[PDB]
Design a protein around this nucleic acid. Structure first.
Ligand SMILES: [Mg+2]
Ligand SMILES: [Zn+2]
Lengths: 49, 97, 49, 50, 50, 146, 49, 1122
DNA sequence: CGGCAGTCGCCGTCTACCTCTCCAAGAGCAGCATGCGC
DNA sequence: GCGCATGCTGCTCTTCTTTGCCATCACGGCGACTGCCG
RNA sequence: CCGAAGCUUCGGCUUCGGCAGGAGAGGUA
């Protein structure tokens, strides 16, 4: 819901997520940028880090 | 805090019990700020009792003004003796009839 | 649509008043639709990303 | 010429009473002066008119 | 040269300086390139001053 | 169409009763600041008025209820309180917007999250930074590629 | 010697692809303008007007 | 010519002109003259069509009155507006931050029908802002300009579209009033006509005709020629009128019991009552002209009638069938056609008078509502006109229009041309027009009806392309709002000299010839066939025996800035657009000089702008100084004119006036007496003449860059003066009163040496960044102390010591001398805001030279920044040692189709050098059409080539081989315009000849000194603790969304993380990074940004229970504090 | 009941930077302070 | 000599929505919905 | 966090003083 709420139609996605009690695993580029972590690409992957 | 320890972000509907849990006090008067004394009112929208001291290690009265008296709640005013950065993270609530 | 009357003079000889006036019909459409294209392409790029 | 100084005038964005040109035009006119010197130290001339 | 960087009075006005006394210079070359490989050049200079 | 809503409230351990409110939260004061306008007065906050309206209506409702008022007047006050809370949460969704000085509609709590000028697309996905500069570029042909 | 071998990043808007950001090695010049290589103008899409 | 003292500029023009260009500021002053009702407009309206000299305010005051109550016992009326004298002159209002206005009075009478007595007295209705002699308003001390608005006019509009399924023609109708309800008749997929009353639902027109009181046989008696009408009358199921009114009532009013009298009172309150419906004079005149109703009688009353509706339906059905002409009982024959709404015969102009009259009307209606409501709650025998009238709504409306409005715009005073152009702008946006987002691509096109009324070239380049335009030179406005243009009438193939002004709706029935047409001595066309303009803007080649009109001049279709480009017909439209736009961005220089090659428009573009001083009478000059001129008239009166020396304009440039007369000259009325900002002896001069070379040079002029010489810096050729203004205010406080004084107990005595005995700086001091301007202190309160400290600091010493420091300092990166101080005080009887005690303003001036990064330009679209400045010994030089001044590249000319610059350089070289044509064996064949004064010229001569009739190419090619030699008998530039240059770095000649000449170069107001910025750390925000924005607040640069995608596509995971946390939001990491950098250690690990916490607290206030979990539940606190 | 088509509301419409102006006020309810009258 | 009356002045809100005011709002896609016809 | 002033054992300690939001218009690439 974090990546879809920041694209378009914040109110509708937030309402549906609240009703459904969704959970976000924070495993994408946009979410890791939002919360302030290393993106899972390039030099931010486990082998190189 | 460490960002490398987060694992989830859950959202859901909030009940009245949760709203009464998060709050640190109930606001009653619609007043905002004292124009002449330049100090927050009581039980208003900017009150020091509900939200926190406007200045560091201070309170509404002048009984405690030093850094060694932290942790003590003023018994005549009700204001905590702590930092002023706690006004960015403490909420309140309104009791609807 | 094409105008059945042509512009017989080059820019090295200079156009007349009427030829210069009717030359400006198509020189404004491009300038006016470039600005719309620039705002139509950015939305597509944001949706593709 | 490296500097000038007029009486009754503080800066170059001003006018002198009775003179048809402001100080900016006077300086631009003085920019064409041809002078010759022999000393190795600054020398000062004068100009008085009425 | 700003008067605040030299310790002078308010009434002083600094002025740009052009110290060059030469106006216009040009040259022309006439080249003798006859056969037998005995060739030389001639230079003519013109100097105009102030 | 209906099962999508009726099954969400069943599969999880929540309740459909969170849609009716009995207490309203209040944002921390430092997130809605009120500051002097260049040695003059304070000129609005766009969020400290929507709270004030709710507080005034609630106080009048409480005083009228604990007085023995007729049912019609209590119903009018309850309708007005409901409208004020609705305008606090989303201004303009139902009826006409609540305006201020200059016929300018007020900005609610849900207007600070939506749009290209909201929190998401203007404060979280892109920021302003330190150690930066700007100037006009010109061509230098004596440089190398690095 | 403070700025020796310390790269900087140059950026022009809009950034339509990767090459809108590139890293150079600074040199001190005289003036108030930045000097850019003639061969990176195609990637930056930058004229000099 | 036609001006008493003017420079002699010889011209290449071959055509004569039968008309002179009008006043260039008459579009602004005439409307205000009509609104005010002054005698000048009264006489002008008496000159032609003197029927109803009605002012602007009088018609509002007469439509308002009388004001009656519900009972009908008393009434109020208004009449006779009149104005007092202006309170303060223009300069006083501009200095003390006031408004230029004059009080307004009206007379009001109160009649009481119960008794019969009358009580009338004069009331005061507030101060009315007034327009100066230049067409501008001074509002709160700032100059403003009100811009005209292009809006669609009221009337009836027929349309026609193509069906989707049946793919046939579908017609529609729309009756649009000035203010009221809308009507819409149309035809549907089947043969069923229907009306859309008040934008709701859809009913067959039979119900409307029945509700108008019509039988079922009269419809056939009139509309008895269509099967559509038969089908509509057959299927109405509303036999009887009352059923129709009930159906209309049930359709309009929802959830009501249908009552016939209420239906009638609601029907006659929508279209037929002159209280809530207004088809204004324009609307009534248009409806009486399209449908061909009664024509000839004067217009009185402005409401719809039944015959109008019947005629509209008849027109619609006739158009649907296919008829071309139609007549109405009692009206003349009219054509049947569909009309276009972008036509200039349908778009009218709302000038300043009609923009102010609307606001006055709104305030009047509010005041009228108040007086009507208050007339029934007061006691009689104490009612007077002064007790019923409230002024507040009117003044509120006036001050809301002249302030926060989209059409009263801040004036631009970069140079005189921009100021003149601002006042001649036609704007398509505003409250009643369009939107920058809703407007499409068909409202931004050059319609064929713009010829002579709007300029097709001068328009903005960004998102406002086609939404803003400029009036043409010969255009003028109707008394209705339609733009006219003049023509010369031709009869029997001979052009006469009688001028008739035609609107776009009247010139489409005549054949109009072309301006560039060969005319003999008698006036007969030479060419057998001429290029004309037919009805629908169609271009044809018809013969010179059937035309009926002709143009007045070749420059009839261009504006005042486009008519200043020489050789315009050789340039493309796109480059000429930029060339016209960039002439309004030039800066004034310390010394001005007129072009070597001009157009002739530059003389009357400077007098009409008004930045020069002209003589109002004839006399001799008595005394001349640097700031005043005294003229003695012939009768005996003496008049003195003062000058503005080093005045600051709206944009920080310098506005300086200088005298150009001697001490014994004779002066004629209209002669220019003093110069101005961008003026050289009365004619506009925006740039300088420089020697050019067209060649590539080592890559320093690559991609639109420019190489300059060093002689342009050592000789002050391109130098400008910029002035700045700073203020501060001294006010009172709840703890005391702030005071301005030199005494400051916090700072040293070294930085308090440039202050006088009052706390202000002294005139002539050079300030710098962080320097001091004024010295002010703030009290912190005077109270008592503890009893112990009383005696303690009686022994030691106790002072007030409540003074804090608040001093006005020079901002970052500014400097310059101090040239003026203006102090306002309260005690010396000066107007001041309440709560403040003293005001002071400080002016700071600097002189700016040319440097790298500055923008230069020409009149043809050339534009670039300066890449290098070279020593004069490093520059290519001619055979006699003359260096060139500027180098331009040759790769940019052919692909942009602006070849007028090369012709300009050729003509400029010929004008600079001077020429002489030999006529020993008669005039040469190429010089047959040249005048006799253009056969010889002197060095440094000024010529003129009009915009569409100038110097040909045979003439230029022949003049390039006649130029005079220099000091030595040498001709440096040959017959092709090319010269051999030497190389100033190596000494060898360049192998091929290069083009040389003179060109006119202007300096644009985009300087690099105002665009450089840098920051390491500085001020931060309050809600989201990110760096501030802007250059004045020492802000940072945005790293947007598109710039993050490049970082993510490169693979740089650490650069992005550092850019997003420890440089923007990480409050605890920002300090540690600085300490680590200073101490030389390693940079620490980023924390968590603050905007995420702000977002979470935002989400929790909408009753959302959002939490951050761990790997095993147990939500993390996410608030620090421990 | 059962289709059905107009209709009405809600969503979206490129990035970065510079300069200027303007941002609810009159009405009303006490609370006295002094002048005037018997 | 005392009581009553009226104007400076603290002092804290208050600002709607009918039978009125108000005047409109692109352009395309999508989806419910809702009266309407059969 | 910065400045001023004292103690200062040279790590620092103490007193006082101090803030940054919207709408509209025009423009450059
Ligand atoms: Mg460019
Ligand atoms: Zn206390």
């Amino acid at each position: 819901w974090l990546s879809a709420a920041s694209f378009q139609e914040t109110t509708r996605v937030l309402t549906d997520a609240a009703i459904n009690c969704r959970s976000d695993k924070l495993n994408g580029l946009k979410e890791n940028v939002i919360i302030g972590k290393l993106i899972p690409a390039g030099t931010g992957i486990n082998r190189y880090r | 805090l460490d960002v490398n320890f987060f694992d989830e972000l859950r959202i859901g509907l909030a009940t009245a019990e949760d709203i009464r849990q998060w709050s640190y006090g109930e606001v009653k008067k619609p007043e905002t700020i004292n124009y002449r004394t330049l100090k927050p009112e009581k039980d208003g929208l900017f009150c020091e009792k509900i939200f926190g001291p406007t200045r560091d290690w201070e309170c509404y009265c002048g009984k405690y003004k030093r850094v060694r008296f932290k942790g003590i709640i003023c018994e005549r005013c009700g204001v905590e003796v702590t930092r002023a950065k706690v006004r960015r993270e403490r909420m309140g609530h309104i009791e609807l009839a | 649509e094409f105008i059945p009357r042509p512009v017989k003079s080059s820019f090295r000889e200079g156009l007349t008043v009427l030829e210069y006036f009717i030359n400006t019909h198509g020189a404004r459409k491009g300038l006016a639709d470039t600005a719309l294209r620039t705002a139509d392409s950015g939305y597509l790029t944001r949706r593709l990303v | 010429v490296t500097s000038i100084r007029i009486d009754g005038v503080l800066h170059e964005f001003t006018t002198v009473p009775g003179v048809k040109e402001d100080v900016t035009e006077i300086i631009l006119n003085l920019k064409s002066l041809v002078v010759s010197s022999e000393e190795d130290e600054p020398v000062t001339m004068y100009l008085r008119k009425q | 040269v700003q008067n605040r960087a030299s310790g002078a009075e308010i009434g002083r006005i600094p002025v740009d300086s052009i110290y060059s006394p030469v106006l216009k210079v040009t040259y022309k070359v006439d080249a003798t390139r006859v056969e037998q490989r005995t060739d030389f050049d001639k230079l003519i200079l013109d100097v105009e001053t102030k | 169409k209906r099962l999508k809503v009726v099954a969400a409230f069943q599969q999880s351990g929540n309740s459909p009763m969170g849609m009716v409110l009995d207490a309203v939260p209040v944002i921390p004061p430092e997130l809605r600041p009120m500051v002097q306008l260049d040695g003059g007065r304070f000129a609005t906050s766009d969020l400290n008025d929507l709270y004030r309206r709710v507080i005034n209506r609630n106080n009048r409702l409480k005083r009228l209820i604990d007085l023995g008022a007729p049912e019609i007047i209590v119903n009018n006050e309850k309708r007005m309180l409901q409208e004020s809370v609705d305008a606090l949460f989303d201004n303009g969704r139902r009826g006409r917007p609540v305006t201020g000085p200059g016929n300018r509609p007020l900005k609610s709590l849900s207007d600070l999250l939506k749009g290209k000028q909201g929190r998401f697309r203007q404060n979280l996905l892109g920021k302003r930074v330190d150690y930066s500069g700007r100037s006009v570029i010109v061509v230098g042909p004596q440089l190398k590629l690095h | 010697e403070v700025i020796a071998e310390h790269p900087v990043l140059l950026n022009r808007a809009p950034t339509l692809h990767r090459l809108g950001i590139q890293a150079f090695e600074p040199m001190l010049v005289e003036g108030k303008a930045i000097q850019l290589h003639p061969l990176v103008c195609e990637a930056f899409n930058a004229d000099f007007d | 010519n036609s001006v008493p003292g003017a420079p002699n500029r010889v011209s290449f023009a071959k055509l004569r002109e039968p008309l002179e260009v009008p006043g260039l500021l008459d579009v602004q002053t005439d409307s205000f003259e009509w609104l005010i009702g002054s005698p000048r407009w009264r006489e002008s309206a008496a000159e032609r069509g003197d029927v109803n000299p009605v002012g602007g305010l009088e018609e509002v005051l007469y439509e308002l009155s009388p004001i009656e109550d519900f009972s009908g016992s008393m009434s109020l009326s208004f009449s006779d507006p009149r104005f007092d004298d202006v309170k303060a002159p223009v300069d006083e209002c501009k200095d003390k931050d006031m408004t230029y206005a004059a009080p307004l009075f009206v007379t009001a009478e109160f009649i009481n029908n119960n008794t019969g007595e009358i009580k009338s007295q004069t009331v005061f209705m507030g101060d009315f802002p007034m327009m100066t002699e230049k067409g501008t308003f001074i509002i709160n001390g700032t100059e403003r300009v009100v811009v005209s608005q292009l809006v669609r006019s009221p009337g009836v509009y027929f349309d026609e579209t193509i069906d989707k399924s049946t793919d046939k023609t579908l017609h529609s109708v729309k009756v649009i009033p000035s203010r009221g309800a809308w009507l819409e008749f149309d035809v549907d997929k089947r043969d069923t006509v229907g009306v859309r009353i008040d934008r709701k639902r859809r009913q067959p027109v039979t119900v409307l005709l029945k509700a108008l009181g019509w039988t079922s046989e009269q419809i056939v008696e009139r509309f008895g020629f269509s099967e559509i009408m038969r089908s509509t009358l057959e299927k109405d199921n509303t036999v009887g009128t009352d059923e129709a009114l009930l159906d209309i009532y049930r359709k309009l009013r929802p959830g009501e019991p249908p009552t016939k009298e209420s239906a009638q009172t609601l029907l006659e309150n929508l279209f037929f009552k002159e209280k809530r419906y207004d088809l204004a004079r324009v609307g009534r005149y248009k409806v009486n002209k399209k449908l061909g109703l009664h024509v000839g009688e004067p217009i009185t009353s402005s409401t719809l009638t039944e015959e109008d509706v019947v005629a509209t339906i008849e027109y619609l059905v006739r158009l649907h069938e296919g008829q071309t002409t139609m007549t109405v009982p009692g009206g003349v024959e009219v054509p049947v056609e569909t009309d276009d709404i972008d036509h200039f015969g349908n778009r009218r102009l709302r000038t300043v008078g009609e923009l102010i009259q609307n606001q006055i009307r709104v305030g009047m209606s509010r005041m009228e509502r108040v007086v009507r409501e208050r007339m029934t709650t007061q006691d009689v025998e104490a009612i007077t006109p002064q007790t019923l009238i409230n002024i507040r709504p009117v003044v509120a409306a006036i001050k809301e229009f002249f302030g926060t409005s989209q059409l009263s715009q801040f004036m631009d005073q970069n140079n005189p041309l921009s100021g003149l152009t601002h006042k001649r702008r036609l704007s398509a946006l505003g409250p009643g027009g369009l939107s920058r987002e809703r407007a499409g691509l068909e409202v931004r096109d050059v319609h064929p009806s713009h010829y002579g009324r709007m300029c097709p070239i001068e328009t903005p380049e960004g998102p406002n392309i086609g939404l803003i335009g400029s009036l043409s030179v010969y255009a003028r406005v109707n008394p209705f709002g339609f733009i006219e243009t003049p023509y010369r009438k031709v009869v029997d193939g001979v052009v006469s000299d009688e001028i008739v002004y035609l609107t776009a709706d009247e010139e489409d029935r005549h054949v109009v010839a072309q301006a560039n047409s060969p005319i003999d001595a008698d006036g007969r066309f030479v060419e057998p066939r001429v290029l004309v303009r037919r009805k629908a803007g169609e271009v044809e080649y018809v013969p010179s025996s059937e035309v009926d009109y002709m143009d007045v001049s070749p420059r009839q279709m261009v504006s005042v800035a486009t008519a200043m480009i020489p050789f315009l017909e050789h340039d493309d439209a796109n480059r000429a657009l930029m060339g016209a736009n960039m002439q309004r961005q030039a800066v004034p220089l310390v010394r001005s000089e007129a072009p070597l090659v001009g157009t002739g428009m530059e003389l009357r573009a400077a007098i009409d702008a008004g930045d020069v001083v002209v003589a109002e009478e004839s006399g001799v000059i008595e005394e001349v100084s640097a700031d005043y001129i005294t003229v003695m008239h012939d009768n005996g009166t003496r008049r003195t004119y003062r000058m503005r020396k080093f005045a600051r304009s709206n944009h920080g440039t310098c506005a300086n006036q200088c005298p150009i007369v001697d001490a014994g000259d004779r002066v004629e009325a209209g002669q220019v007496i003093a110069d101005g900002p961008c003026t050289d002896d009365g004619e506009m001069a925006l740039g300088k003449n420089l020697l050019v070379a067209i060649m590539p040079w080592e890559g320093h002029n690559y991609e639109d860059a420019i190489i300059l010489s060093n002689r342009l810096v050592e000789e002050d050729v391109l130098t400008s003066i910029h002035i700045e203004e700073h203020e501060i205010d001294a006010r009172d406080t709840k703890l005391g009163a702030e005071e301005i004084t030199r005494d400051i107990p916090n700072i040293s005595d070294e930085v308090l040496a440039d202050l006088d005995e009052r706390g202000i700086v002294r005139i002539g001091a050079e300030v710098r960044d962080g320097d001091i301007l004024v010295g002010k202190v703030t009290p912190k309160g005077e109270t008592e102390l503890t009893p112990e400290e009383r005696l303690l600091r009686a022994i030691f010493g106790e002072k007030a010591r409540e003074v804090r420091d608040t001093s006005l300092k020079v901002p970052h990166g500014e400097s310059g001398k101090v040239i003026g101080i203006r102090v306002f005080s309260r005690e010396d009887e000066d107007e001041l805001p309440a709560g403040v005690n003293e005001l002071v303003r400080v002016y700071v001036a600097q002189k700016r030279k040319i440097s790298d990064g500055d923008k230069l330009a020409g009149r043809h679209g050339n534009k670039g920044v300066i890449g290098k400045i070279l020593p004069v010994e490093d520059m290519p030089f001619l055979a006699d040692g003359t260096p060139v001044d500027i180098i331009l590249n040759t790769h940019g000319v052919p692909r942009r189709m602006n070849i007028g610059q090369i012709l300009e350089t050729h003509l400029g070289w010929c004008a600079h050098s001077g020429w002489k044509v030999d006529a020993a064996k008669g005039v040469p064949d190429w010089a047959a059409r040249l005048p006799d004064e253009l056969l010889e010229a002197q060095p440094n001569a000024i010529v003129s080539t009009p915009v569409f009739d100038g110097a040909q190419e045979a003439e230029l090619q022949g003049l390039l081989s006649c130029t005079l030699p220099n000091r030595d008998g040498d001709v440096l530039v040959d017959a092709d315009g090319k010269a051999m240059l030497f190389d100033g770095r190596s000494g060898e000649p360049f192998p091929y000849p290069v083009t040389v000449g003179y060109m006119y170069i202007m300096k644009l107001h985009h300087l690099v000194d105002d665009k450089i910025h840098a920051r390491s750390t500085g001020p931060y925000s309050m809600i989201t603790q990110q760096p501030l924005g802007g250059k004045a607040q020492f802000g940072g640069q945005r790293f947007g969304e598109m710039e993050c995608w490049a970082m993510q596509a490169y693979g740089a995971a650490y650069t992005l993380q550092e850019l997003l946390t420890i440089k923007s939001d990480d409050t605890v990491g920002r300090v540690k990074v600085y300490e680590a950098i200073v101490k030389g250690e390693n940079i620490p690990e980023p924390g968590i940004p603050e905007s995420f916490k702000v977002l979470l607290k935002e989400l929790q206030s909408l009753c959302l229970n959002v939490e951050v979990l761990s790997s095993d539940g147990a939500a993390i606190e996410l608030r620090e504090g421990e």
